[PDB]
Tab-separated table of C-alpha atoms and ligand atoms in Angstrom:
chain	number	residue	atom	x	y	z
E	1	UNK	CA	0.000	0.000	0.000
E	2	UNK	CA	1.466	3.206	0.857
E	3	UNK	CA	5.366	2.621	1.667
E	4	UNK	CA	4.745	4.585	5.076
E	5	UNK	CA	1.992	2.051	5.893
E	6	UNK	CA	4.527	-0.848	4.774
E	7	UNK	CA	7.514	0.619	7.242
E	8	UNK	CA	5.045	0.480	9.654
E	9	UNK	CA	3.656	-3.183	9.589
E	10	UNK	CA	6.895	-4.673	8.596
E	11	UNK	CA	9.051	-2.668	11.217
E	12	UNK	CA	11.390	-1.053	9.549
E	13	UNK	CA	10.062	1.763	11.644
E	14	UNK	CA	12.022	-0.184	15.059
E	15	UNK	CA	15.299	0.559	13.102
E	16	UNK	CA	14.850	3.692	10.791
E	17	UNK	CA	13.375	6.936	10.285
E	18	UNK	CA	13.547	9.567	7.046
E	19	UNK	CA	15.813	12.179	8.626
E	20	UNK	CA	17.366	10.492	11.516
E	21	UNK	CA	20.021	7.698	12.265
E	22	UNK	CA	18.850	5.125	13.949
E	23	UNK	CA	20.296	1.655	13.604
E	24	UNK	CA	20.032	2.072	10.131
E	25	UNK	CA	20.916	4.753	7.908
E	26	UNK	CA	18.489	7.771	7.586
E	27	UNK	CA	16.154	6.925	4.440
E	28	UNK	CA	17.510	10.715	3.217
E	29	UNK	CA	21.102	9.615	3.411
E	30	UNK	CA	20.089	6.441	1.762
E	31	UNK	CA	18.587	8.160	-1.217
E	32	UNK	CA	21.396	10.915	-1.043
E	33	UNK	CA	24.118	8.163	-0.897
E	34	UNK	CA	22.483	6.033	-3.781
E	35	UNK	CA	21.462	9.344	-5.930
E	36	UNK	CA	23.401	8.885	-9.525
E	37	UNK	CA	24.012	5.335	-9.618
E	38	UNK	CA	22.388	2.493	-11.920
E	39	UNK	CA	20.510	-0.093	-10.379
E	40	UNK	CA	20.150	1.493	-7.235
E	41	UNK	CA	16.218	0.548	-6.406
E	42	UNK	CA	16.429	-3.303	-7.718
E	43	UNK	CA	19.914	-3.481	-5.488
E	44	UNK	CA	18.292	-1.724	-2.516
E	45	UNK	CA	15.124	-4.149	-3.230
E	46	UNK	CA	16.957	-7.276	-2.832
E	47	UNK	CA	19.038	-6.049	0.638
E	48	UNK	CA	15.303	-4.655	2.056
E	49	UNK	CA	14.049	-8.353	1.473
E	50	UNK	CA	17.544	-9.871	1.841
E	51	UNK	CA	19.604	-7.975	4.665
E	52	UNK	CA	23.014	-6.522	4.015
E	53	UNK	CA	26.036	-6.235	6.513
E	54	UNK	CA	28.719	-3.961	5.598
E	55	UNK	CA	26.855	-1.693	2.974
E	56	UNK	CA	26.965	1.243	5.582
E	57	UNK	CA	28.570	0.121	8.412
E	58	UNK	CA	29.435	-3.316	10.765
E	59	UNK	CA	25.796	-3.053	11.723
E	60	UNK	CA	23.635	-6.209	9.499
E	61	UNK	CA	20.475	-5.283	8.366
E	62	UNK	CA	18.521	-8.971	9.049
E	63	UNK	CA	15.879	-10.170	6.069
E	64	UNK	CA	12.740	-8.384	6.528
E	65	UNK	CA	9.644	-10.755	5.805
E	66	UNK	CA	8.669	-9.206	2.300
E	67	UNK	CA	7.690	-9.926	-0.889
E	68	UNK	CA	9.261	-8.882	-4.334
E	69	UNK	CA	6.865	-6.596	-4.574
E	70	UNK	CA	6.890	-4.544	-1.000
E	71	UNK	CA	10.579	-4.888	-1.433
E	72	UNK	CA	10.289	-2.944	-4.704
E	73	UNK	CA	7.557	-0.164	-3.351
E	74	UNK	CA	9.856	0.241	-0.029
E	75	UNK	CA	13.206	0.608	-2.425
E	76	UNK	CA	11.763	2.982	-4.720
E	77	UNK	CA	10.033	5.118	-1.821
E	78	UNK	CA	13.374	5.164	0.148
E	79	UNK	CA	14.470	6.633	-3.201
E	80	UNK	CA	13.112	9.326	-3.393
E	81	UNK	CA	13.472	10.720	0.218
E	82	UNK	CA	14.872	14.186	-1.109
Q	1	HEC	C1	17.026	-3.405	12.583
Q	1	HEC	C2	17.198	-4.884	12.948
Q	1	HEC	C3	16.564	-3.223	11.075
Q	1	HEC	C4	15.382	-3.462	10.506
Q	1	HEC	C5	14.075	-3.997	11.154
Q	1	HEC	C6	15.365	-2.791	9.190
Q	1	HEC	N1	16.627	-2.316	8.934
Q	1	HEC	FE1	17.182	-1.597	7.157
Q	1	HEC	N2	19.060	-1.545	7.835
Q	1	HEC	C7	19.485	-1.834	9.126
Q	1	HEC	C8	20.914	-1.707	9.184
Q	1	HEC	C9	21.806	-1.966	10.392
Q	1	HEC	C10	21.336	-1.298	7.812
Q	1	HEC	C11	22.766	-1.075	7.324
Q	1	HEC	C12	23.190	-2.462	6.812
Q	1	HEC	C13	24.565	-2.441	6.188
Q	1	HEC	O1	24.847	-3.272	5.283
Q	1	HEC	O2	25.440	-1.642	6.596
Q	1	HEC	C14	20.134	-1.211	7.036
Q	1	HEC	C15	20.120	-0.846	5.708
Q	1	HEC	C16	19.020	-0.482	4.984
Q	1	HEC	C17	19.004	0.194	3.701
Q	1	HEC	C18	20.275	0.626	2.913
Q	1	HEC	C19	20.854	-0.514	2.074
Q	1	HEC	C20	21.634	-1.526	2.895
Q	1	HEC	O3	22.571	-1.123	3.615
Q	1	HEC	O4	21.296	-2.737	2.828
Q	1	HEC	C21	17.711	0.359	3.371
Q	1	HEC	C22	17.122	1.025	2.112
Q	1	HEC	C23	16.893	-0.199	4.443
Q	1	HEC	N3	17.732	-0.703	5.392
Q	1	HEC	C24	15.523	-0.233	4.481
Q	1	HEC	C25	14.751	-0.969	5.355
Q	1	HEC	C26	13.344	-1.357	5.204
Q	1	HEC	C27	12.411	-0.836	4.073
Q	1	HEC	C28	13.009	-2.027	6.312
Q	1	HEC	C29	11.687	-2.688	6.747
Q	1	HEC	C30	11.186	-3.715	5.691
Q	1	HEC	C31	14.207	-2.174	7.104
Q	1	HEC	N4	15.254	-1.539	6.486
Q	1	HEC	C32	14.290	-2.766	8.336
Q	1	HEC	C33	18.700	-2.207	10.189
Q	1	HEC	C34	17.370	-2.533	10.063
C-alpha cells in the first residue's frame, strides 16, 4: 500500500526513520548516498528483502519478511526521500 503504511507493519520503523540515524541509515542519506548510480532501487530491493552487513557500516540489516513486490515499493520510496 502506501510505503509509510509498509515501514510500519513490517518494522522497519524499530530501526529507521527519514531524517534520523537510527540503527540504520536515515532513508535521506540512503537516497542521497544512492542518488546517480544504476541499479540502485532493484539493489536496494533485494538487501530490504535480503539484509546486508557492511553496505553502511558493521551493523547487518537482518531479512525483513517481504515480498518482491513490497521490497520494490519500499526501495523505490526510500528513493526518493529528497
Ligand atoms: C534493525 C534490525 C533493522 C530493521 C528492522 C530494518 N533495517 Fe534496514 N538496515 C538496518 C541496518 C543496520 C542497515 C545497514 C546495513 C549495512 O549493510 O550496513 C540497514 C540498511 C538499509 C538500507 C540501505 C541498504 C543496505 O545497507 O542494505 C535500506 C534502504 C533499508 N535498510 C531499508 C529498510 C526497510 C524498508 C526495512 C523494513 C522492511 C528495514 N530496512 C528494516 C537495520 C534494520
Amino acid at each position: 500500500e502506501d510505503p509509510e503504511v509498509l515501514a510500519k507493519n513490517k518494522g522497519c520503523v524499530a530501526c529507521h526513520a527519514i531524517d534520523t540515524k537510527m540503527v540504520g541509515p536515515a532513508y535521506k542519506d540512503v537516497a542521497a548516498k544512492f542518488a546517480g548510480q544504476a541499479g540502485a532501487e532493484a539493489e536496494l530491493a533485494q538487501r530490504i528483502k535480503n539484509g546486508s552487513q557492511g553496505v553502511w557500516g558493521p551493523i547487518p540489516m537482518p531479512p525483513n519478511a517481504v515480498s518482491d513486490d513490497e521490497a520494490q515499493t519500499l526501495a523505490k520510496w526510500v528513493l526518493s526521500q529528497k
